[PDB]
Design a protein around this ligand. Sequence first.
Ligand SMILES: [K+]
Lengths: 87, 12
Amino acid sequence: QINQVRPKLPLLKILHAAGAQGEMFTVKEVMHYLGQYIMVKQLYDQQEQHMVYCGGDLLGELLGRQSFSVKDPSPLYDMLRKNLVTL
Amino acid sequence: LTFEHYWAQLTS
Ligand SMILES: [K+]
């Protein structure tokens, strides 16, 4: 289905860790579970919550970065383009 | 001011 994507294995692991089920998802679902992952693992900066620190986390390996800012999502979107297989 | 507030902005 054109509105779905298939996350590559390591990204799927992250989504499943946050409660997702299955192999195919809409982009909004991917974002929901990835956000839940960051929230429950409390990877965001407590004082400046737009900042996410993920050094040593599988999320950091996917990003190729120790941290990123939700205010400049480009690196996050780059990771999703590489890890979301589309039609 | 919260992670959720900023994160929600990434999707319409
Ligand atoms: K933290």
